[PDB]
Design an enzyme around this catalytic site. Sequence first.
Site, PDB file in Angstrom:
ATOM      1  N   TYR D 106      37.179 -16.274  20.578  1.00 27.55           N
ATOM      2  CA  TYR D 106      37.647 -17.184  21.612  1.00 27.55           C
ATOM      3  C   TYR D 106      38.630 -18.177  21.019  1.00 27.55           C
ATOM      4  CZ  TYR D 106      34.070 -15.893  25.139  1.00 27.55           C
ATOM      5  OH  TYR D 106      33.301 -15.276  26.088  1.00 27.55           O
ATOM      6  N   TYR D 145      30.878 -10.289  21.552  1.00 29.33           N
ATOM      7  CA  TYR D 145      30.813 -11.566  20.841  1.00 29.33           C
ATOM      8  C   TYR D 145      29.462 -11.861  20.191  1.00 29.33           C
ATOM      9  CZ  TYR D 145      31.354 -16.527  19.848  1.00 29.33           C
ATOM     10  OH  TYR D 145      31.416 -17.723  19.174  1.00 29.33           O
ATOM     11  N   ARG D 155      26.892 -10.592  22.613  1.00 36.23           N
ATOM     12  CA  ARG D 155      27.240 -10.533  24.026  1.00 36.23           C
ATOM     13  C   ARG D 155      28.035  -9.258  24.234  1.00 36.23           C
ATOM     14  NH1 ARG D 155      27.974 -13.932  27.369  1.00 36.23           N
ATOM     15  NH2 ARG D 155      26.910 -12.351  28.658  1.00 36.23           N
ATOM     16  N   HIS D 158      32.868  -9.128  27.883  1.00 34.75           N
ATOM     17  CA  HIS D 158      32.784  -9.722  29.213  1.00 34.75           C
ATOM     18  C   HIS D 158      33.902 -10.702  29.507  1.00 34.75           C
ATOM     19  CE1 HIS D 158      31.137 -12.659  26.510  1.00 34.75           C
ATOM     20  NE2 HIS D 158      31.310 -13.578  27.442  1.00 34.75           N
ATOM     21  N   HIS D 160      34.702 -14.145  31.878  1.00 33.48           N
ATOM     22  CA  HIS D 160      34.154 -15.250  32.646  1.00 33.48           C
ATOM     23  C   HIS D 160      35.015 -15.478  33.879  1.00 33.48           C
ATOM     24  CE1 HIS D 160      31.283 -16.753  29.612  1.00 33.48           C
ATOM     25  NE2 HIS D 160      32.141 -16.237  28.750  1.00 33.48           N
TER      26      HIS D 160
HETATM   27 FE   LIG Z   1      31.538 -15.639  26.766  1.00 35.21          FE
END
Ligand SMILES: [Fe+3]
Lengths: 238, 238, 238, 238, 238, 202, 202, 202, 202
Positions: D106, D145, D155, D158, D160
């Site tokens: 990120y 992630y 994770r 995905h 958001h």
């Molecule tokens: Fe996330």
Amino acid sequence: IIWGAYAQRNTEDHPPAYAPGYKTSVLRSPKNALISIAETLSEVTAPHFSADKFGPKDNDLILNYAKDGLPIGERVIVHGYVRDQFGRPVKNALVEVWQANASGRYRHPNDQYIGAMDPNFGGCGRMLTDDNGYYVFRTIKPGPYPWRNRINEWRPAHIHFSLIADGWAQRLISQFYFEGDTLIDSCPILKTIPSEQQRRALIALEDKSNFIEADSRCYRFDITLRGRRATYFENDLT
Amino acid sequence: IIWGAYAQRNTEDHPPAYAPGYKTSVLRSPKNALISIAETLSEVTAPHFSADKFGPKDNDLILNYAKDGLPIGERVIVHGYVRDQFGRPVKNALVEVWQANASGRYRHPNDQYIGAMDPNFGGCGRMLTDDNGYYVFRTIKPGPYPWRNRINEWRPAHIHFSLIADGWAQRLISQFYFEGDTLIDSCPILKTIPSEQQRRALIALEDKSNFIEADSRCYRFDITLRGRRATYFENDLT
Amino acid sequence: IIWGAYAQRNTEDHPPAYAPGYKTSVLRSPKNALISIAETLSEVTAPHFSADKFGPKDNDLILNYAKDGLPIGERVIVHGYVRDQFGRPVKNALVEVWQANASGRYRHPNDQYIGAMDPNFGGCGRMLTDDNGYYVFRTIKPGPYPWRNRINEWRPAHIHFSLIADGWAQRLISQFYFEGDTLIDSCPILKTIPSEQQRRALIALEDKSNFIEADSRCYRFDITLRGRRATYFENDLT
Amino acid sequence: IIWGAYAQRNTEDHPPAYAPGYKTSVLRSPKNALISIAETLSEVTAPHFSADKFGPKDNDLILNYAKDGLPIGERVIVHGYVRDQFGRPVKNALVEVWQANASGRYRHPNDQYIGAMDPNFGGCGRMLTDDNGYYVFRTIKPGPYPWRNRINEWRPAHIHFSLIADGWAQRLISQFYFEGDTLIDSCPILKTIPSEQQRRALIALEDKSNFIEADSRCYRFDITLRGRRATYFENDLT
Amino acid sequence: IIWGAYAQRNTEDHPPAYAPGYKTSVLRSPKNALISIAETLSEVTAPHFSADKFGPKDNDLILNYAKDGLPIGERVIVHGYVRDQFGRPVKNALVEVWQANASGRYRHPNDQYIGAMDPNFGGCGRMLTDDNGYYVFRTIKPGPYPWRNRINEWRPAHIHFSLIADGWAQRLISQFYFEGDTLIDSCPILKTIPSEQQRRALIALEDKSNFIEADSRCYRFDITLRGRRATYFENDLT
Amino acid sequence: ELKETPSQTGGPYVHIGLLPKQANIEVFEHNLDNNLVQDNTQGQRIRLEGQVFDGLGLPLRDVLIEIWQADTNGVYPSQADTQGKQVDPNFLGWGRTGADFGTGFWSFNTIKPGAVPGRKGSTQAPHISLIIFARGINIGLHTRVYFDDEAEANAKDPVLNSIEWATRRQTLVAKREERDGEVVYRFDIRIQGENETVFFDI
Amino acid sequence: ELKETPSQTGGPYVHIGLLPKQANIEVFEHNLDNNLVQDNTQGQRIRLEGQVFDGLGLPLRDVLIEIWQADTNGVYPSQADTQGKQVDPNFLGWGRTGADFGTGFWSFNTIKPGAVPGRKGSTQAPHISLIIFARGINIGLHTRVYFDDEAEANAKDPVLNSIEWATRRQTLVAKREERDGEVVYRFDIRIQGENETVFFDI
Amino acid sequence: ELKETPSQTGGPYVHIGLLPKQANIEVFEHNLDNNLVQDNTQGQRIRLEGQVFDGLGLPLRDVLIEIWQADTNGVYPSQADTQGKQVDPNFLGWGRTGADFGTGFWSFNTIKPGAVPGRKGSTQAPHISLIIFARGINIGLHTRVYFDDEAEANAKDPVLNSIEWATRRQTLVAKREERDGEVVYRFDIRIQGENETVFFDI
Amino acid sequence: ELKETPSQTGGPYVHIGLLPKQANIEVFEHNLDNNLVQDNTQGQRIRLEGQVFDGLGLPLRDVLIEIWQADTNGVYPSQADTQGKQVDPNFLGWGRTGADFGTGFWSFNTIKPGAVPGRKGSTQAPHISLIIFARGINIGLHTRVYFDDEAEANAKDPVLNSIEWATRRQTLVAKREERDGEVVYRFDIRIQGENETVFFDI
Ligand SMILES: [Fe+3]
Ligand SMILES: [Fe+3]
Ligand SMILES: [Fe+3]
Ligand SMILES: [Fe+3]
């Protein structure tokens, strides 16, 4: 909406070019694989046919060739919808059909079948789909046709249809059959199609509620053509 | 679009006239078979009712008869759609309903049931469907009704409804019930209907998402009427 | 133990040479059947590669080409075992792999895909299996690759691998895929393989327990090669 | 049509506030039950965002942050429809998305993951749905992630998303995943959702027919928001 | 082989800390979630116990406390293997067990159960696993134990066991039961375990072939501990 | 791949099998205890004591405790220690004890551990790994004991700094005292409520 | 009928997509912020500030907040407003902000809302609808901010009176202050524990 | 018993992993090539060259080739060789190359192999085992290269005589040439059509 | 999403429905034919003729052909044409014909098309899209007709250059001739065997 190219034709939903069971395909099928290309204006454009040129009985095979009387056979109406794979209706598409008569006899110089000719039946018609992709024509139900693939081969009753719509990539010619015909399960031509679900896509269904009392029976048959994808980013078509 | 006649009523989807289990039908059912006819303008036409004549509370059975207070019972809203068999919405059709009160008591001179009368409930209303065939009324859920077929017979809770739409051939009167009512499985009147799927077509479904908090519950009930076929060739109606 | 010949390759567990669905195979597949031969020393022998020649980062595709920084993409470790069909481990076999980067872009002159090139990723590595037939390398998970078979064809994410083991008859080159990739069910190349169980033999499985926290994910993929039969009677190999 | 309140949010179709498996929820979840209220103008109203303020590349995560070149990763298009629970399209709703890059990294100060940063990828975009509730954006498929719930938690890939539509009661923020991702079955966050059918409602489906040849793949993902009930009797909203 | 950290403990395969059905856990369970950490030398190391310190009857609960005669009860032998999750045997691990006697009476000051004490039974033993992870001890089958969770609660017959192996992260204490015990299906303590397959992992199986004629019966019970992952790239442990 | 054997509480009579003598059972000649200091053990002797309280603030009178630690030089007496340094030959590094049935107090006589290497070349502050077993506890609870006189080292400790809720870090620091000439670190564990001790999943 | 798409936490990096600039990402020319007052916005300016605390009494340094309110005359700048009155043409009525990564403080520069009509002809006291999104929060938390200087209106407010636990009503009232000449309402939100803020399911 | 891992085409970019330098990728210090002759390799040097043509008579510009052969004395540098003779210590016996992207020509610099023992005490004529990998080829194609100047040995070769269609045997015989002083055997491979090269399932 | 209706052969009597007059059926007043040139059609008239041969080198005497092309300025008389230029108002751009039952010859009287825009700003050489339908042919075969007198444009044509087997490109080029004063392009199609015409999946 800025249209892009037509979705790729799914070769798996169609008969291959080479199908030994259908004999004449052995010498009339390329040995080389088809070369796929990215579409250009040539592939996404198609001609337009004005309804002004069509006669009032063009979609009525019962009367467009009637001379002294009515054709002998089963009076049936065939209707349905023409959509693209994304469900959008196909407007003003040219639909052309042709078939044999009730004896399973074609009005064609090369047909010597013993089946009797009907002086009042021609066997061909045409129409344009409306704004909802709806089409409708009347005819005599065709009788099965004996032909020489294997010596005792028999085509199930069927009607030939051709479509010319919005894009050249959509050009399609095929045949549809009638629900319940037992000859459907043994036809080498229909068997060139790989999947069972695709074979059933060529069967016109009995539409009993739309039968016209003391007059005609009715079959429902929908046609699906390739559809264009919309473009929201780069437009490389041109 | 040039409309033809209404599709033939499917006698198999309706109760026969003679149903021994429903006693009063024994003497009030023709012994002769109904004579089917080809439709004329008489059968495809029907009267028109202007909304100007309807009062503001005509579709509100909770208030259209309320004098000193509110009726006693379960506040419920009933809505749904009226379509013809081909899925087309039925616009401006007159819908009339009538029912018993929460005690299962009808406000009718011939009803002597011990069930208590509600001075603030009448039991009848009416509406016109909108352009989408949608209808909606409010009422008190009716209580089951004891009646004399066999001595201990009991009608499940139900609401009587009548429709007058576009064609006389569509004229229909029936009754709908509420999902879950255990009396539904033993009602001789509901059992006059041959198939199980048709019996379920008379059951209003609980529509929980449309419940109005601290106020009313809601049931969904769609009605299907006969539909007209379109004509593309000869128009023999006239 | 006196070794004999390798077991016969089961042609049914492999794709045929001619596979119309995979277009380029049409012109690059022999028309004549392969001629099977009894094995000689030529077929049961193979070269030996000393580990002395391999660099420390040869099996690390994340770092063996890293110049200014790390490659962009999913850090994944791939490991597994190489065995012969009889379950025996294959020791010191040369394993060579190559793949596209995270964009599905290959570092090859003939690749013009719009997918972005990664200045820090090369896409090739190699290793030797240990005494237990175990192998392990690190890499960036490859992105799917668009290619022209049918115009809109897409290879599922995959890694190319090659093995040179103890016998020339074992020479094998193939590709493995990642569990869950939806493109696996529509790939014409993967579909050249006749059976479903054999197709699944090319899928690397998620090995969650071997994931390295805050670092890398891990896939398990075992390879099976042809195995030699032991001889207990005549030794006709020579 | 006189609109009433939004249908009650079905708490059973959403994760509870307290979910021990998702550790940080233990201290950030109220101990008291939420207090339900009857809606007022405050809850049924929401702000309006004019498209004039949005830039041409706001919905293109591949180019809106590109400086020297293109981002590294899988070029994918995501589109779908936004409807309310009653099937009505949600027009001009603000859709905001954000995600990690192809490395699962990120672009946020608090992210120290070893996964490589992409100087040409930002990870955020926004759009307004059209009159049909349709939305469409382009991006790089995010990589899984790693995070610290249990030490080796991961994770699944995905994106958001956040929606601000017609009513404040509709305010929703969530995440969608990609079909086939094996990490979906073990994610503690996705598991906070009680039912299996609701978990699947967050999975974007591969939309192969909408793939753009030699360019991008495509996923279909529809979003459903709460819907308002119509009022036909008392209007107590005000 | 350069060892890394132990695989993450799967919290789903273990009972949660808070289990209302097991009453005493209500006040002895943290309200805060456990904080997961990356392992260091502290977590991967563990003490070593030399067999020199163990007595000859330490693993024989039938004789290690026998004074005047033999204990009253069912002579049973319990053996099995201790492996890590990757199947590797756990060598020289300290196994300590303790149980009640045949009356279901524990030799502990805080036990006031009416069940009779056995002057010749102690109820505790210990062993070290061998190079194959194999362990074996002899004992008297314990009788069920009544306890106060709900007033009439009864523990199924069981033996308490503790393991100290190669890593502190492996530290485990648990209980195993005997196949067929009907009390197994209603024990609140055994029910703290979420899955059914994990509950069955605590059941010792009857090993009839290993029964010793006219002497003892035998149960087979294998124990699985967490296992370390091997490292082939960076070694961040230190 | 196999799943780990599921945990179960040690139960109220855990002493029978792990601390026989405390349950008045003499069966073993060599009994494992809470004394890690031997004759030739290196380092400064220290006493670790405290209590374990439940959600009511009441001490557990049936809890069993074990500790694992490195020697005075930060080397674990374990074949798994990869430091390459020679460990104190007279140190087991492990001990076990049980709270007193009446008062709830527990204690260990050990040595203050030396700093142990952390991950990625870091250095951990001196600490003792501790685990709790008892009736009501389904899975042994892991925690660590740091020392308040090592403030500088604790401030740089990786594990303590991995706890984002800073105010909780102090629950892991024992307080130094001096009963005459002996060094005593008091470490009270609170399973529930306020000042709840931090517990780790290792 | 379809089910509502299930909610999921905004996650720790919610700023990337909702407050790019706070995450140091400049991609949009027009960035949505916490300033609802424009040049010609009517009404008295006010500043709404505070913190959000977890169950440990610690502020969330990664929480994102949004508010929705009517103009100075109690009219919402929404086509859904049925009052028939003209709304302030220079008021969006909505704003978004994020707690400070270091201190946890958040704030909005807005206008004090006018009274809005309640159900069945009632009148609601002035209030601002607020929602909380953050890591650990599975579904956005709804609440309302009332003002302590509107005691008379609050006493008659339908929503506040629909809360049967009277002592909790105060958690929804912000306190007025005056940093020099500016009006500031302090509103601290407590997700858990004592004085836990009332949260609504709207 | 397990099934052999199914084969898949090497694909158009097979060079990346098997011939990095040809794809302009310098990652390995030691790169495997098409040169089997070392400084002290015994035997007469020879050059093997040719092209691979598809069904259209067009050369494959993306094909990869490998060869496996014995030393000058007919001994394979493999532990699997059971002849009991010492092999040339300076001979790998294996090589790999790729057709030229532009012309399609490939070549190897090697040594002419000595006769190798056949099955049942027979003797095979000198030959080189060759395999073809490329886009469109699902499974590597096996074939052998014999030499036209070994007519007497070829006439008695077991493998060549196991091919019942005699006219096809010639497709496996390379033609000797002499560019100045160097010996060159031309071997063209035809995958399809007339004069299709014989391929073996070994 | 629906699947495309599966294709089926047009069959031996395809003339009945698509070319009634050739089957001696007069039912339509307006019959679609092979004459695309009208009175006021712009451009130079040309005649396109040839034969279609099967795998035996024999002409198909039952094949039906259709062509689709742009006007003299490279604009298609289709609403799908996005060039923004006005197309020739007297040009359908489409035609249909059938091989002669006896000789197998087919022909169209049309206009030579102007260059049409290609993808990504490229320019296509003048061409006519052609499709083949007939007994034995399961799906209509697509191909293109280019002209030999447009050598310079053909060399730069995107579609022709997308065919990697260069020798096949010539099968798509018709040869210009001049029967007196009329321009005639001969285009023979070979479905199978040598010089097999290139067919496209469009
Ligand atoms: Fe996330
Ligand atoms: Fe017990
Ligand atoms: Fe590839
Ligand atoms: Fe036919």
